């Protein structure tokens, strides 16, 4: 009994709705009457398809367990008082005006902005990684921004617990995360269960911040690899020897030789410390790729770096990655109980 454009009934607490929609259901802003601030509300309607259930549960479990200035929280979650009556779930969050994807369509960023956004991306990422979680879908639309340049990472639906022991797979194994921000190893021999997959995406985001265009816009699964290799050049023998997978190694060896395009050719207006950090994020071999704490400690970020102000999670995270649709509904109901006066 309160609509927008569908039903969007968010109790007595939240009023003066206004569409911003099509994200997960639909998104509105709304006046919060207990805190008198405007806030964002996302309506989730996932109990039909069993995969949107999994993404929803995963996202709720993470959002509630994580507490960090550069990671979007869930201030409130609204659903029916019973499982029977629960059809929709609404997640209430800090209202963030824009995201980096929308910003970059229209705005050039000064070096000071690039530096600050990157610092905040990596500060959030350090927390995430310290919990043994991988985000796995970092991209400019998953980076929210407010009018005062605060950056918050959102969308933990593809997130997983890190599992480097079980990261190997065969050549051309299908993947779900967004193509342009996929590390080379996803196409070759990785399931994306190590931390280095997120650092690659961050590197892609940096490159995008410096030029306002995706650095590796592959049209489909292997074109992505040829984009990467067209800039980085052919992998060294020693990087090839880290790929044991014969199908992947022989594929790479079949390719004509390509030299590196130097970053300063691609990004002639860029701060050279920015390009050095970029280089180290967009390293072909995931074993040699810089880690989140090394990136924060890089000279480019020296105006911000302060590890005592770069918090870590209080304990490791415990196993997303799995259950029929009816059990999932029940877990979601149980995970959201703390917001019920009930």
Q: Count of alpha carbons within 13 Å of 285, Cβ hemisphere only?
A: 14
Smallest CA-to-CA distance from 166 within 58, 328, 321, 62 is with 321
* Cβ neighbour number for residue 231 with a 10 Å cutoff: 17
What ranges do the domains of the chain cover?
A: 1-95+322-342, 96-321
Strand partners, 27: 42
Q: Count of alpha carbons within 13 Å of 81, Cβ hemisphere only?
A: 3
Please indicate whether the domains covering 1-95+322-342 and 96-321 agree at the CATH topology level: no
Catalytic residue among 32, 137, 155, 198, which? 137
The number of angstroms, rounded, from the C-alpha of 241 to the middle of its chain's C-alpha atoms is: 30
Using an 8 Å Cβ cutoff, are 9 and 2 in contact? Answer: yes
Smallest CA-to-CA distance from 181 within 196, 202, 160 is with 202
Q: How far is CA 40 from CA 92, 150, 189, in A?
A: 6, 16, 39
Experimental technique of record? X-ray
With 0-12 / 13-18 / 19 or more C-beta atoms within 10 angstroms meaning exposed / middle / buried, residue 117 is: buried
Q: Count of alpha carbons within 13 Å of 334, Cβ hemisphere only?
A: 8
Using an 8 Å Cβ cutoff, are 133 and 153 in contact? Answer: no
Domain 1-95+322-342 has CATH 3.40.630.40: no
Instruction: Tell me, yes or no, if 163 is annotated catalytic.
Output: no
One CATH from 1.10.510.10, 1.20.1440.80, 3.30.420.10, 3.40.50.720 for 96-321: 1.10.510.10
- Name the 3-class secondary structure at 66: coil
Output DSSP code: residue 49: S
Structure tokens, 234: 């052919």
Structure tokens, 214: 């995706």
Structure tokens, 227: 């984009």
* Cβ neighbour number for residue 115 with a 10 Å cutoff: 21
Q: Residue 271 and residue 233: Cα distance in Å, rounded?
A: 22
Q: Residue 287 and residue 290: Cα distance in Å, rounded?
A: 8
With 0-12 / 13-18 / 19 or more C-beta atoms within 10 angstroms meaning exposed / middle / buried, residue 338 is: exposed
Q: How far is CA 31 from CA 15, 39, 152, in A?
A: 5, 6, 21
């Amino acid at each position: 009994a309160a609509a927008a454009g569908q039903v969007f009934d968010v109790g007595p607490r939240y009023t003066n709705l206004s569409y911003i929609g099509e994200g997960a259901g639909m998104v509105c802003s709304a006046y919060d009457n207990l805190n008198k601030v405007r806030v964002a509300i996302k309506k989730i309607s996932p109990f039909e398809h069993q995969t949107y259930c999994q993404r929803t549960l995963r996202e709720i479990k993470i959002l509630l367990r994580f507490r960090h200035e550069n990671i979007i929280g869930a201030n409130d979650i609204i659903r029916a008082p019973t499982i029977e009556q629960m059809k929709d779930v609404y997640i209430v969050q800090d209202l963030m005006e824009t995201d980096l994807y929308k910003l970059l369509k229209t705005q050039h960023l000064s070096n000071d902005h690039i530096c600050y956004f990157l610092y905040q991306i990596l500060r959030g990422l350090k927390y995430i990684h310290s919990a043994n979680v991988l985000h796995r879908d970092l991209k400019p639309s998953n980076l929210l921004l407010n009018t005062t340049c605060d950056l918050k990472i959102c969308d933990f639906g593809l997130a997983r617990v890190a599992d480097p022991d079980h990261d190997h797979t065969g050549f051309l194994t299908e993947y779900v995360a967004t193509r342009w921000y996929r590390a080379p190893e996803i196409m070759l021999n990785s399931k994306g269960y190590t931390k280095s997959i997120d650092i690659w995406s961050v590197g892609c985001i940096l490159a995008e911040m410096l030029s306002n265009r995706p650095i590796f816009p592959g049209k489909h699964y292997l074109d992505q690899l040829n984009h990467i290799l067209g800039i980085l050049g052919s992998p060294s023998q020693e990087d090839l020897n880290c790929i044991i997978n014969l199908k992947a190694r022989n594929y790479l060896l079949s390719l004509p030789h390509k030299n590196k395009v130097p970053w300063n050719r691609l990004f002639p207006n860029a701060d050279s410390k920015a390009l050095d950090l970029l280089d180290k994020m967009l390293t072909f071999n995931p074993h040699k790729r810089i880690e989140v704490e090394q990136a924060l400690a890089h000279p480019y970020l020296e105006q911000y770096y302060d590890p005592s102000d770069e918090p870590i999670a209080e304990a490791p995270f415990k196993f997303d990655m799995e259950l029929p649709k009816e059990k999932l509904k029940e877990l979601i109901f149980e995970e959201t109980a703390r917001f019920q006066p009930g």
